[PDB]
């Protein structure tokens, strides 16, 4: 049997295999038509975005995301339309020779740009994405699947209709097939399992979204080759070591880090406060940990302004872990390609941690850092060898 | 929702995460108990294998696989039992230090053997596998999932019962958890999609089985990093080039190759006959191609003995492809990490092929070879750094 997400991903692969062979004039042309269709329907899009903003205001939405949601504030919409033209006007990203090497007489190797394949784009609260990604995908010869959050449902619906319709309407003229771009109108998380068909995930949102995607997928994530890296600060963590090791994981960077803290580790809060007011690090705490951290600070009078604003470059999450076994369990839920560290003076715990974790690399009392959207990440490479009958048996 | 195969794979991952931390005495001990249980139940296993042999004889089964099916011929069963002991007697494969490097004073790096993780073992018609793989898996700290073919259903059933029961019976004594080995009694091909949980596929059967597995999975396959590589011999293939290029793909090897032949390519049979009686290559033909190949040979009187036996090291399949577009379609159904070649003098076709294929590397009139069970492949490596508070900021 074929699931909904499987069929979506399969159709994307089929669409991409046609899209990759369509001329630049055909791929650029559909972008001009789409620009025109979006402009001609601006008023309908604006009304749908108006429903979205007002719905978000009346429910729980943070004034930051709310400002990202407004497509018609200032000249946001006009810039988005302009970006479609800018992209359509670029030189063909595909079929460019990056490297040519004469291997032997009449035997030449080329490295040629080619589409990545199929893109899954997951965004939250920024409707501009639909236009930017549709443009970049068709231009670069990639099929795309787009999934937005609840906040833009109305704007997403209207824009999807216009792109779907325009692609259908101009297929015979442009060559660009229906399905080149599929805009998923909440019909699932099974898409992240389709790594036989999907080549790249492009996340457009918060750090929390990236972390969630990383843990639920084997498809490469644009800009994030590594999984979440954890430091477990054990009950018997040395505090000086715990402070230096944990700070060093910041001052080295585009990486996703979790601090796993044993509550029985004495002065564990001095470690978080040392990260904030010495490394300028923002700490994304779980509710129960933040409530415990703030109480210890307020009891000491040390709950300064500089802590309150930086407790919710580098990510850094922090949560409790009440034993070595619990730290292991937490670590073993992360999608692989991550390193992990334990800070402890207890050898029985260190050895248990190192035997227990699913990790490429594991550190005991040493820093994990000892381990050595545009068209950018949307084109890959194909090698082509063009000879005249040469075989691997030459003298 | 969680599918049957997802739950199987998830439980395997959970089992493996416990199994990896059980002592060698515990892992070796369960192997001795399993050896004893299989020996004590030999007569029951023999009766079940008797049903299997007689069922296979009365239906369509090839005397080759039939001979693999007989567990009690000669001393096959006694050797299998002996192999369990041999494995239980080996030195712990896990926790061995392969490499130690002093990175700095009191900062040392180790490369330590560790389990691969979860193994999916798919075999056809060889019941010995159940014992060998169960032994190697538990010994090396890997959880295993076993799926056999229809031919051994009875022997598989009886043996599964004995292993399941023994693992359950001795869990509190050995530490080795229920689920360390799951023997799937036809309850699916969805397991090959579980690459978030399954780390390695171990195929134990024919080349056709390997090819099928390779095309239906993103999980690495033991002994087969590369996908199926195709050579398309176009209508306008030069015959001298077609012969040399295609022969060279043999005389270079453990690889899976398909020859895609255009029927309108003149003397295309001379290419297959050149592979057989010059490279000693066996050709695994589709029915319609073999029937066409034999007729052209019989019409020329050239259907020798040496062709008939070698038409059904290197695999080499052969099938028809009636255009460049059809060759492309065929190639694009293969799971990635493969190179592909077109042999043609037609440039429009060559360029279409190179633009159309999903391939790392593509060759036009040049040979694809220009691209540069024991405990062996069941242990991977973990790096461990053991310091005393050292951070990535040293002078
Ligand atoms: Cl070129
Ligand atoms: Cl150049
Ligand atoms: Cl050159
Ligand atoms: Cl060691
Ligand atoms: Cl050594
Ligand atoms: Cl050393």
From Swiss-Prot, chains A, B:
Recorded family membership: Belongs to the gamma-glutamyl phosphate reductase family.
CDD domains xref list: ALDH_F18-19_ProA-GPR
NCBIfam families in the cross-refs: PRK00197.1 (NF001221), proA (TIGR00407)
Additional remark text: Present with 6920 molecules/cell in log phase SD medium.
HAMAP family, per the entry: ProA
EC number: 1.2.1.41
Catalysed reaction equations from the record: L-glutamate 5-semialdehyde + phosphate + NADP(+) = L-glutamyl 5-phosphate + NADPH + H(+)
SUPFAM superfamilies: ALDH-like
BP-aspect Gene Ontology terms: L-proline biosynthetic process; proline biosynthetic process
GO cellular component labels: cytoplasm; cytosol; nucleus
Modified residues (N-acetylserine): 3
Name of protein: Gamma-glutamyl phosphate reductase
């Amino acid at each position: 049997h074929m699931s909904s997400s499987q069929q979506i991903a399969k159709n994307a692969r089929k669409a991409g295999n046609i899209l990759k062979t369509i001329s630049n004039e055909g791929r650029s042309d559909i972008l001009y038509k789409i620009h025109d269709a979006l402009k001609a329907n601006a008023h309908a899009i604006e009304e749908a975005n108006k429903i979205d903003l007002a719905v978000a205001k009346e429910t729980g939405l943070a004034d930051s995301l709310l400002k990202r949601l407004d497509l018609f504030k200032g000249d946001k919409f006009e810039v988005m339309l302009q970006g479609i033209k800018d992209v359509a006007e670029l030189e063909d990203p595909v079929g460019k020779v990056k490297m040519a090497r004469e291997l032997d007489d009449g035997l030449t190797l080329y490295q040629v740009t080619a589409p990545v394949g199929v893109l899954l784009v997951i965004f939250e609260s920024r409707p501009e994405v639909i236009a930017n990604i549709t443009a970049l995908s068709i231009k670069s010869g990639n099929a795309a699947i787009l999934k937005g959050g609840k906040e833009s449902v109305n704007t997403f619906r209207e824009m999807a209709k216009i792109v779907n319709d325009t692609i259908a309407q101009f297929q015979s003229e442009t060559g660009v097939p229906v399905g080149s771009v599929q805009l998923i109108e909440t019909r699932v998380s099974d898409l992240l399992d389709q790594d036989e068909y999907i080549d790249l995930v492009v996340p457009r949102g918060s750090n929390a979204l990236v972390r969630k995607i990383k843990d639920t997928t084997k498809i490469p994530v644009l800009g994030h080759a590594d999984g979440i890296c954890s430091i477990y600060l054990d009950e018997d963590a040395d505090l000086i070591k715990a402070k230096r090791i944990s700070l060093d994981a910041k001052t080295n960077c585009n990486a996703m880090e979790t601090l796993l803290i044993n509550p029985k580790f004495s002065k564990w809060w001095e470690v978080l406060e040392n990260l904030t007011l010495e490394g300028g690090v923002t700490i994304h705490a779980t509710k129960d940990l933040k409530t415990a951290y703030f109480d210890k600070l307020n009891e000491l009078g040390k709950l300064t302004e500089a802590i309150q604003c930086k407790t919710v470059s580098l990510d850094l999450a922090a949560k409790f872990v009440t034993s070595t076994e619990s730290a292991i369990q937490h670590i073993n839920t992360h999608s692989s390609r991550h390193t992990d560290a334990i800070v402890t003076e207890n050898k029985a715990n260190a050895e248990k941690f190192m035997k227990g974790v699913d990790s490429s690399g594991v550190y005991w009392n040493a820093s994990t850092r000892f381990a050595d959207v545009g068209l950018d990440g949307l084109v890959s490479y194909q090698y082509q060898i063009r000879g005249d009958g040469q075989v691997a048996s030459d003298y």
